[PDB]
Amino acid sequence: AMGQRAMKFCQGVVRELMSKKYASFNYPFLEPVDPVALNCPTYFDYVKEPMDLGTVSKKLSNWEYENLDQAEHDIRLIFQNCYAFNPDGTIVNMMGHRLEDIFNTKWADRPLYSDV
Numbered sequence: 001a002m003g004q005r006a007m008k009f010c011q012g013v014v015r016e017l018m019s020k021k022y023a024s025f026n027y028p029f030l031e032p033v034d035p036v037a038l039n040c041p042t043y044f045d046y047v048k049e050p051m052d053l054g055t056v057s058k059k060l061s062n063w064e065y066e067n068l069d070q071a072e073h074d075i076r077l078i079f080q081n082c083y084a085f086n087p088d089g090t091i092v093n094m095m096g097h098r099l100e101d102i103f104n105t106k107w108a109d110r111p112l113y114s115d116v
C-alpha cells in the first residue's frame with residue numbers, strides 16, 4: 001500500500017476537492033449517486049463503476065490504494081461517470097468540469113518517483 005509522502009499528497013488533493021470552499025459545485029460529488037432519491041432510474045444503464053469523492057477518501061484512509069495512479073483512476077471515474085450520464089450544458093456537467101480542472105491542476109504536482 002501507498003507510502004507516507006504519496007499518501008499525504010493524495011489526502012491533500014482529496015481534502016481540497018471536498019472542501020467547503022468549493023461547496024457550490026462539489027456537493028453532487030461528495031456522496032454516491034442515489035438514483036432512487038434523485039429520480040434518474042437509468043443511471044446504472046450508463047454508469048457501471050460508480051464513484052464519489054467520499055468513497056475515494058475512505059479507500060485512501062483504508063490503505064486500499066497501492067499507488068497514486070490507482071487514486072487518479074478512481075477520481076477520474078467520478079467525472080467520466082458525470083459526463084456519461086449528464087449531457088453537455090447541464091448544471092452537474094458544468095460542476096464536474098469545474099472540479100475536474102481543479103483536480104488536474106493539483107494533480108499536476110504529484111510525486112513521480114518512489115524511494116523506499
Ligand SMILES: COc1cc2c(cc1-c1c(C)noc1C)ncc1[nH]c(=O)n([C@H](C)c3ccccn3)c12
Pocket residue numbers: 027028029033038040081082085086091092
Ligand atoms: C443532477 O445531478 C445530480 C444532482 C445531485 C446529486 C448528484 C447528481 C448526479 C451526479 C454527480 N451524477 O449524476 C447525477 C444525476 N447529488 C446530490 C444532490 N443534491 C442535490 O440537491 N442535487 C440537485 C438535484 C442538483 C441538481 C443540479 C446540480 C446540482 N445539484 C444533487
